[PDB]
């Protein structure tokens, strides 16, 4: 995944637990050499898995818990590190924002040629509820999707309830989340 994602993790851990903590994770993660991550360059997905892993260990939190937190953090980080306009253009409400996500990730893909974005389909079951389908070339990130949705809820001052109803990691075709929102 592009360095942006890894800068963001790093940013999150450093603001929340400081540079030493970060350095520890960095060290444990096997990446002592990387001086700084390059936003617009593509790294191996491993760099991210190891980072998450190392943070799990150093912080005594399951990885999934960290993915959730990284997920809602990402909504703030992007609004402030140069994608706020792009974010805003993608919707004025959660359900609109989710319908526009594939599009958002395509506008991003222009600037980022090796992007493997996720694919998201929304099936509205009511004007306050939807069933969100997440499809991905990667495994393990469903918990991040969940944090992102909670991030978007805070952004649009909207209360949101999210429960994952189907799982890839077992052998269901893709992750589905049932969502309820004001």
Question: Which spans of this chain sit near its own copies (rule: CB under 8 A)?
Answer: 60-62, 64-65, 68-69, 125-126, 129, 131, 142-143, 146-147, 150, 159, 161-167, 169-170, 178, 180
Query: Is the CB of 17 or the CB of 45 nearer to ligand HEM?
Result: 45
Strand partners, 123: 131
Q: Is 2 annotated as a binding residue?
A: yes
Nearest alpha carbon to residue 106 among 128, 81, 77, 86: 86
| 3-class DSSP assignment, residue 118 | coil
Q: Which of 55, 148, 176, 179 binds ligand HEM (CB under 6 A)?
A: 148
Interaction pattern, residues 62-101, with ligand HEM; x per rule: CB under 6 A: -------------x--x----x--xx-------------x
Q: Which of 136, 156, 178, 180 binds ligand HEM (CB under 6 A)?
A: 136
Question: Kindly report the CA angle at 86 between 105 and 161, in degrees rounded to 5?
Answer: 70
Q: Which of 30, 39, 53, 117 binds ligand HEM (CB under 6 A)?
A: 117
Q: Assign residue 8 a region: left if phi > 0, alpha if psi is -120 to 50, beta otherwise?
A: alpha
Distances (CA, A) of 124 to 34, 38, 151, 175, 180: 44, 38, 20, 16, 10
Query: Is the CB of 7 or the CB of 17 nearer to ligand HEM?
Result: 7
Query: Is the CB of 7 or the CB of 180 nearer to its own copies?
Result: 180
Residue 76's binding partner among its own copies, ligand HEM, none (Cβ under 5 to 8 angstroms by kind) is: none
- Alpha-helical runs (H) found in 60-167: 63-80, 84-89, 94-99, 101-111, 142-155
Q: In the structure encoding, which two tokens stand for residue 176, read together?
A: 């589905």
The annotated binding site for heme b is made up of 2, 74, 105, 116, 134, 136, 138
């Amino acid at each position: 995944m592009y360095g942006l994602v890894n800068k963001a993790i790093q940013d999150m851990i450093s603001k929340h637990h400081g540079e030493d903590t970060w350095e520890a994770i960095k060290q444990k993660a096997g990446l002592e050499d990387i001086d700084f991550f390059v936003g617009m360059e593509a790294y191996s997905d491993d760099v991210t898995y190891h980072l998450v892993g190392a943070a799990s260990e150093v912080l005594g939190k399951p990885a999934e818990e960290l993915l959730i937190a990284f997920g809602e953090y990402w909504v703030t980080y992007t609004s402030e590190e140069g994608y706020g306009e792009l974010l805003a253009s993608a919707g004025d409400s959660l359900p609109e924002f989710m319908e526009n996500l594939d599009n958002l990730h395509a506008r991003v893909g222009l600037s980022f040629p090796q992007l493997r974005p996720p694919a998201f389909e929304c099936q509205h079951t009511s004007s306050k509820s939807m069933e969100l389908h997440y499809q991905s070339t990667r495994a393990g990130l469903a918990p991040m999707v969940l944090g992102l949705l909670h991030g978007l809820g805070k952004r649009f001052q909207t209360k949101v309830e999210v429960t994952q109803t189907a799982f890839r990691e077992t052998g269901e075709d893709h992750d589905i989340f049932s969502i309820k929102y004001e």
